[PDB]
Amino acid sequence: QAAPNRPNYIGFRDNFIGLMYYNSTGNMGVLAGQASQLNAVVDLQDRN
Amino acid sequence: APRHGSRPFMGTWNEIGTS
């Protein structure tokens, strides 16, 4: 006998979620001024 | 201070354009 397998449309993440490391205190990011290293993004690991 | 800058560069309907 036989049948179809199911179907898992495995594609990328609406909003492209994840592809950027957002709130997390390890990997995090920066946007300061080549002139002070004074970052401006402090993402407390608790803001989704 | 021999001038005023103002600011009217806003499309223009007539003598107008803001808010």
Partner: protein, 49 residues
Amino acid sequence: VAPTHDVTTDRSQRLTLRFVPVDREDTAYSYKVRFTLAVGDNRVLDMAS
């Protein structure tokens, strides 16, 4: 009518300027890049775009 002047760069500015990484770092489960995003004097940039 549109504004006559004082809102348009007349010399060679660049729409959609491109930047490429000046530093790269790859781990088994992450990718790390940093660009020297130079706005350039006499300009204003919105990061919404």
